[PDB]
Design a protein around this ligand. Structure first.
Ligand SMILES: [Cl-]
Ligand SMILES: [Cl-]
Ligand SMILES: [Cl-]
Ligand SMILES: [Cl-]
Ligand SMILES: [Cl-]
Ligand SMILES: [Cl-]
Ligand SMILES: [Cl-]
Ligand SMILES: [Cl-]
Ligand SMILES: [Cl-]
Ligand SMILES: [Cl-]
Lengths: 291, 290, 291, 290
């Protein structure tokens, strides 16, 4: 029913030529006026894709490249993760936890969620490193998902579940990091998750390096604040089943932990998850938060 | 002629007839009476087009561009290994060895160490694997490994490779076999990762390997209580190095930011853009003493 | 000339019995109305002693025990060290340095000279240690002499030399630590000196342990503030010549420096000095401040 | 009788005729058909007065109170060494050895280690001594050293010392000779400093020795990469322990406050007040397993 009428695609001109752009968020709202995504993640994504593909055809428009689509599925996946996480802390009644969907480091460096005291220590570290004949640099990135535990960060609005997608609750789920900017105590993060389409070599390596970068950063903070009990775990979540070969490889030791006999041995990536269904998201978070 | 080349093959995997490039034969065929010189890119293209010509003459399927990109890497790596072999000779660096390493599956890095060091590592490795959650020590092989240990030099290493033959190619690609189980840990001078380009994935491979190799070396420094032993890791690109990539390659070695007494260092000490074969010499000149 | 008139001794009653107390400071003033102590330290001390002994005799008073005298010589030595140090920074024109004579830890814990930021880190360390099934405790002591470098701590009054002893300039030299309480940046201390009557076993051991206690404390601060360049040296100064046997023994490595291959090897006591003449005090300080 | 004792001597140093107590003869003489029991203080006084009586009968000079205080320490130490010998036997602790160590000048602590460990320490020691300003590794001997290594136990260690003879005393005071160069580093369980009192100087001796021994052990843990090896150091007083002294003995081991991953620990893990010989057993019971 009336597709030449969908808004999941838009025409626009650039240099007098007409181009077509997909509108991922309108696609979501249009297909989720009464429920949130359930069952197979890949199935919900294929549906959204085909939906946009049907709308393009009914409008007799130029068809978007595989690229445009591969990118849109990512934006949809990001929204799915964010929404599920938002409803997870609600149904699990985790009043002291925030599971935030983070954008890329250039959009909003997650480090900005840290309070002033913590950021100054990291800034002092950076300045220290960059002050050497041969320049060394502290380069960090953003985990796709952050699990934070700090009761005072919880607003009552966060406790209302999302039963259907709207421009408003989607925007709120994707800009949650803005509410806690500069408010997080360094030891309030409990974990970070790197979400990958698959464990293809390059993507598996990204999990490994990111885990080393973030965990060592936290280890540095533990020495600055002299808090041996502070803990930060880093996880990986693949959209494809995980093979033993990849699982084996994701057992690699965090490099900063093999130079001091007093540090507990630990992997760069504490564990790897396979997300097929939305329930797999809840299961992953269950293992991450506790038990 | 071209219908007779061996630089390309046709095999029957299960079902279809898949084609496969024979990188070393391409080399032996194009370099009969001399080793590659001048522009590295020129030689890579030359080798590439040669294959393409052969494939046309054979009237066989064209190998995928990805397949070419991979074979290009093998050629890049091998040609650099040959330069290094000859470099050691013309520079008369008797005590040094610039060894081309195979991939991890072919030969595990640790195997180069003598017994004293292997035992220390196996000990670190077993302690790791023995915890409620297993933590493994996974290592990688740097494309090139420079070591200084006088007693490992054979007189035949002093014979330059003036021509590429299935044989000159083998002495160079199996040189690592001669030193297996014989390297004192502090004999290692540096490792070098060779990439055709600093494409995101390849750049990260350099960053991780430097972290992997340097941390292991830092562990051994602790074990032997030798603060002075030094091990550097470098990267090399066949393409020019952008200011951006260079900045990304300044990333601090993670095991370096946990103790204030640690001299802060990069995961990759320096990146080199190898345009000509002379640039290879220039790189080695800096790596071995600058 | 008129001793039955000296004030270097005082009578007082306690429980209806009359007792005699030496007044070390009056002895100093009375014998240094026109000059500060010079030449042999032991000679200046013996003189002061005999002086008080002559005054006791001229007053026909009960004679003070060896103890009372051994204690008074210490108070005199403390004043001598303090005065010499005060004139040293003046004649050497060290406008950014303060060489302070410190009392015992119970009178005024030297740690109180540290700014708030530094003291909180140490308090957090203490609380951390004392919070274990088996209680561990951070117990520090006071070096007898502190060399501090922080320009903003210098007052013009400090730049007036002391040409003769008075109740006023002696009091100022012995309470200098009060002017800088809570004002010192942790990395502003450059050194501490433990002053010993001799290197008798127990006294030599005190230098060794104190050096380990203070240097490790500073090493802890270097990790908290992430300043690898901050330096703190600890020295010993004996009032007797130093034998090779004792010098050898005072080469013992600071125990906290032998567990990490990345830390520079260092002695618990960086060097030992022999103070015979007042010039030996200047020489010691010269080696401590620089060159 | 008393004019015949050998517990006291008269020697001609240069010039005068100085007297000298013979602590072991005092012991052999007072304990012919049984080892000391009951109150340690009682036995110390007994031994002391015995000497004093002998000195009177000999009509010789009275040794200084300081000299007595020192001989009191030797007796305290020795009697505790004998209890321990017998303790190991009655408890049937086959794998343990409770060794009385001589002073550093007589036998350097390190000498108890096997070759592998001595080499690691000599290496640490030479690296230290080789710097612009020499830094030495000076060690001390804990009065008692408890070790667990089954292959060092001789059947004759299982023979209790039922009487004090120049001979039972020697097996106990030379037991350390049997294990020289044979102790695996992680065979060390604990060390114990024995003081007649917690007088400031003696208290500090305990604090320093614990710092000295524990740091050395922590170095070896690093070298062997064995986080689990454990070494504790204890103090023991013949006098009761005041709340104040106990608090002073809570001082943190200095090598423990520099790395946040270090479990925080005391220089001296615990202090014991040995009033009776039974208290010695009680102490050993806690030290060996609690
Ligand atoms: Cl949209
Ligand atoms: Cl920051
Ligand atoms: Cl802090
Ligand atoms: Cl081939
Ligand atoms: Cl070794
Ligand atoms: Cl007075
Ligand atoms: Cl404080
Ligand atoms: Cl800080
Ligand atoms: Cl004797
Ligand atoms: Cl080992």
């Amino acid at each position: 029913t009336n597709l030449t009428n969908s808004n999941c695609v838009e025409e626009y001109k650039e240099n007098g030529k007409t181009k077509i752009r997909i509108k991922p968020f309108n696609a979501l709202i249009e297909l989720y006026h009464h429920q949130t995504p359930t069952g197979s993640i890949k199935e919900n994504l294929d549906k959204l894709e085909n939906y946009v593909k049907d709308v393009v055809k009914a409008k007799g428009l130029a068809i978007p490249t595989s690229g445009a689509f591969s990118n849109t599925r990512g934006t949809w996946f990001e929204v799915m993760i964010a929404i599920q996480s938002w409803n997870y802390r609600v149904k699990r009644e985790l009043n002291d936890y925030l599971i935030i969907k983070m954008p890329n480091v250039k959009t909003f460096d997650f480090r900005k969620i840290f309070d002033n005291e913590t950021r100054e220590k990291l800034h002092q570290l950076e300045k220290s490193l960059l002050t050497h004949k041969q320049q060394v640099r502290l380069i960090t990135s953003n985990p796709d998902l952050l699990i934070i535990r700090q009761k005072d960060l919880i607003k009552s609005e966060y406790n209302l579940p999302i039963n259907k997608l709207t421009h408003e609750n989607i925007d709120v789920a994707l800009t949650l990091f803005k509410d806690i900017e500069g408010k997080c105590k360094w030891d309030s993060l409990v974990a970070g998750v790197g979400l990958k389409t698959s464990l293809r070599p390059d993507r598996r390596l990204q999990l490994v390096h990111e885990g080393n970068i973030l965990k060592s950063l936290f280890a540095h903070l533990k020495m600055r604040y002299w808090n041996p009990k502070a803990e930060f775990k880093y996880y990986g979540a693949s959209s494809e089943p995980v093979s033993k070969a990849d699982d084996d490889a994701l057992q690699t030791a965090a490099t900063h932990t093999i130079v001091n006999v007093n540090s507990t041995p630990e992997r760069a990536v504490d564990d790897i998850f396979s997300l097929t269904s939305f329930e797999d998201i809840d299961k992953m978070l269950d293992q991450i938060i506790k038990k």
